[PDB]
Design a protein around this ligand. Sequence first.
Ligand code: NA
Ligand code: NA
Ligand code: NA
Ligand code: NA
Lengths: 252, 252, 252, 252
Amino acid sequence: PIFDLSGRRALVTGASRGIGQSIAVALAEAGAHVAVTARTVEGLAETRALIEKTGRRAVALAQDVRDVEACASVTRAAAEGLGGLDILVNNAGFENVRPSFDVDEALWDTIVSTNLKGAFFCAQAAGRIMADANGGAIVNLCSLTSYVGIPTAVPYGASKSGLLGVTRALATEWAAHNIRVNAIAPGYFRTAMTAGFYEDEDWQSRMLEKIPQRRFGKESDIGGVAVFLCSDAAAYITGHCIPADGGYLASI
Amino acid sequence: PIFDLSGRRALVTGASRGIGQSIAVALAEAGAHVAVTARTVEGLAETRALIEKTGRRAVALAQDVRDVEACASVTRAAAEGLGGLDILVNNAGFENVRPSFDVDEALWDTIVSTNLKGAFFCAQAAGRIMADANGGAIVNLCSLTSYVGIPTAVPYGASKSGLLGVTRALATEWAAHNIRVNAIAPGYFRTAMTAGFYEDEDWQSRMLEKIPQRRFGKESDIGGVAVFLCSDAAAYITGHCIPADGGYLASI
Amino acid sequence: PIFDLSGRRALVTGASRGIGQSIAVALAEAGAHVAVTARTVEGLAETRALIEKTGRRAVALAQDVRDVEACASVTRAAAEGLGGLDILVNNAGFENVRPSFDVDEALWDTIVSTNLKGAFFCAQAAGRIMADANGGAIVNLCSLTSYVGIPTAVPYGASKSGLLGVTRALATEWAAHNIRVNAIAPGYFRTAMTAGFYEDEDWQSRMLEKIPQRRFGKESDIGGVAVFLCSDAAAYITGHCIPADGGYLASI
Amino acid sequence: PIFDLSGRRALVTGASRGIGQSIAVALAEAGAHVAVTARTVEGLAETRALIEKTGRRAVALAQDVRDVEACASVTRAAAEGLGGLDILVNNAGFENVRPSFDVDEALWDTIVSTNLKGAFFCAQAAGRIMADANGGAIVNLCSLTSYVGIPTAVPYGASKSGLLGVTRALATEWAAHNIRVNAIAPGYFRTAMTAGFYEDEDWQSRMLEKIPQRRFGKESDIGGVAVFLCSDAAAYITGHCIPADGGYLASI
Ligand code: NA
Ligand code: NA
Ligand code: NA
Ligand code: NA
């Protein structure tokens, strides 16, 4: 019962694949009715089918989190489709590496709008709905770059470090509305390591030596973390970021 | 299933009351067979009765974690009573305030032996058993004093700050044995606020204003946190400390 | 000699008053030739007069750090006026409180462009100059909001938390160019507490009780911190943020 | 003037070689009269000669920081030789690696007594002297193990993590006596890498790849850091730990 989400209503952004898909499905498996977004509705087909496998309802909507209007209207539409809204997972994110001397304005904007600004304005919209009803839980997807710096991932790291600041300030501000706000910093997860960058085997060997568990994360390594942060088991946890990283941050 | 502990075998030290009692009972409620210790067996009567209410087995043993021998022999005896050992909660702790100019050797020792050294040597003993079988999970009880300083609680804060260091180093060292090592830093919990210190109402008002949730922790605010850190949902979490503090650390 | 900045060439942004003015003057007092910027040249009159009091050269230029072009051209112009550039202090910042349900797009942008994006693009420009010569030091002005959350200061906290991420990633990326990148998080400084918000005396009493030194910062409490981070005494410090806060973060 | 220590009176423990020797000499070079301790007086010959090179007075005394009595009496004797005491550097430390399954009671004690307990009781003694006069500054030597875990360095990491907790709590408690308490976490310094462990060249290559500056620390990389934390430039810094690590902690 303490981890059960039966009857909760969740929105998970950028949920067509990877982490967001894992989280969305795990929320449905724990009892929740789940709305999922992506750039196109058609890219959600696998996520929708995996959710409806649980028996629960899946709402699916188009959304670009860079459009501040769509952050609000598509969040309100998600609420209407579910009959309410008391869980938000801000997963949507643009990943990028680029030498910092070569970052132009446009790149900066695409990264920060998507990863930081978008999550704020989705939070604001879901928050207002939660505040008018009986509260809820928000989970932001941060990164190892909220704790350390990756060279050539400067705008990205700014984004995710900023989002951790957002997590703490919103937690403090919205506790009085019964809204908890927490974050997960995934380490290196197989399902997020699509980019050509990651096949470089010397890189892989080097990174694995920094991870005590000597493995990259599977979907089972994060879904339950998101359920936990949304559940009554986490009633006294707010403004906190749980790293799911196989021990990377703890390790020399 | 991801949060289920059925068939796991747990040891929780200093479990006669408070946090340790809460954790022990919540482990039993999640499926585990639980061994509990305290200075005397007789003080465990309430904890034993609450566990056996779940239908599960409760082993109960006398242990002073200041005796390094009892850290080993009573841990091995707990294993024998359960038929194994794959969860350890190091809860045992001596709390104290004393102006630092007035701390003598003996006080220092009592606090650090109990809170830090004891937990190391219990970890070592449970660890070796886990390492010879198929691994397990260890959860250390840290404190807000692992993050900030409380005036006149210097030895205590050294203890709990040290234990966070222990959590990180053991996590890194023992991941190769399939042993995860994590911690919980409780904030201010009603069940731990027995000492005369805490009735000072100006203190209470001042502390509550630093906690976004404007409340002190209940047993439901930590039991599920310990279950989570022991479960398959936390398979990729190691060397981490989850604060359960109503937002205190996140807040200005 | 280890703290001496004789012959160094510095740029300090948003230096007409407050922290930035304090830092700029302290750099000049430690030996540096200093360029200072603000929205208008005329607002720099006090800062210029205090610098020229040291005997050293003061260059003064108009700059809006929200204009990415001015981040580059006015930084290059500062270099030309000084005959080089090997210190950058990113001080420029827009402070704001606003209930998060009431933050609109425009406010978000003004805060984040000024505080985070501006500092990145100034860093990039100063960085490229330093990288083409013999390196240098960059100091970013962060805030307590890089560590905790202030309710109704969400965009601001995102900005300053992001800038700490920027500090770490740039440090890691640019060490190979002999460019150190560090930050200072001022606590509550008298010279920065202009806004009407801060006269609320109950607030003042409450904040002072959270600061072990029971006082707000003076200009002498930060100038030397900036000199230090720029000096040979800090040759092995990079990617770090020094809080100057009278013990706030360390304290319960 | 802001970094000048003329007329200050300092005690640096375990100062015969390495970090402690570097700090002691740098304090003397910045103006201070310096007392230095070690197990034997004869081992201080090089440190004494380097101090007296500055023209300043060097007091030298035998001290085992594991003896709580010697923590007090030898600190009071250092005061008498100097004519006062307003700087303490707790440098004394026993380094060790040992598989945690193989740590016995005696080893634990030697490590924690030396590294944590000793520094507390030296702080207490220097503190009381400072509190009876006009205050002062204390600097504790922490380690990367205050932030991350090194496998087989568990007792050591407990010690140094604990000492960071001590730094924060003492800072909070003793600010009202005009005593600032801060720490330095050295990274990997050439002068501290004596143990046979460190010649393993694969280790060296691996560690250097984790350090952005791609070098180990020299004595010039820490001496100025200690002077800074003792100076008027650091008047608003207390309870803080400065890592001198070539960017290790900031870096992925
Ligand atoms: Na690490
Ligand atoms: Na707080
Ligand atoms: Na604090
Ligand atoms: Na690192």
